[PDB]
Amino acid sequence: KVFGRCELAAAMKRHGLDNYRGYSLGNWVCAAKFESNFNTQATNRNTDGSTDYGILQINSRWWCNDGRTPGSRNLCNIPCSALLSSDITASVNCAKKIVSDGNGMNAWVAWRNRCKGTDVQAWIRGCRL
Known part of the structure; x- marks a missing residue:
């Protein structure tokens, strides 16, 4: 599924990402935009x-099991295939653990390169949240 911008914003806010660990909703929408272009x-x-999976490109080496990654750990306790669903619940819950893993949102390279330090509030424009 390919989310519309505000559609994803609403979905994320519904799952408690707005201001989670101090990161405004705009940060998450921006991260999603550049990590997967809103494609689940x-x-x-x-x-x-x-391999990186889903809307937030979660990595198989430590967060999910895809059965083909050497010395991989499954810290989020789920098959990577679950991160490719139209429902973002699995990705959001796993993401909440990742952002609290000692690096903040820096864990997402696309967020760091295209979102960090920018006016991320723009990613929420036009949305009736």
Whole structure:
């Protein structure tokens, strides 16, 4: 599924991401936009044998099990396939653990390169939240 911008904003706010750990909703929408362009089925294979899954491109080396990543850990206790669903619940819950893992949103490279320090409030424009 490909979310509309405000549609995703609403979904994320509904799952408690607005201001979570101090990160405004705009940050999450911006991260999602550049990580997967709002596509829940987005996948990116890495050169280390791991793969990034879903709307927030969660990595298989530590967060989910895709059964084909060496010395992988499954800290979010879920198959990576669950992160490709149209329902973002699984991705959001896992993301909440990731953002609290000692690096803030820096864990998402696209957020750091295209969102950090910008006027992220713009990503929420036109949304009736």
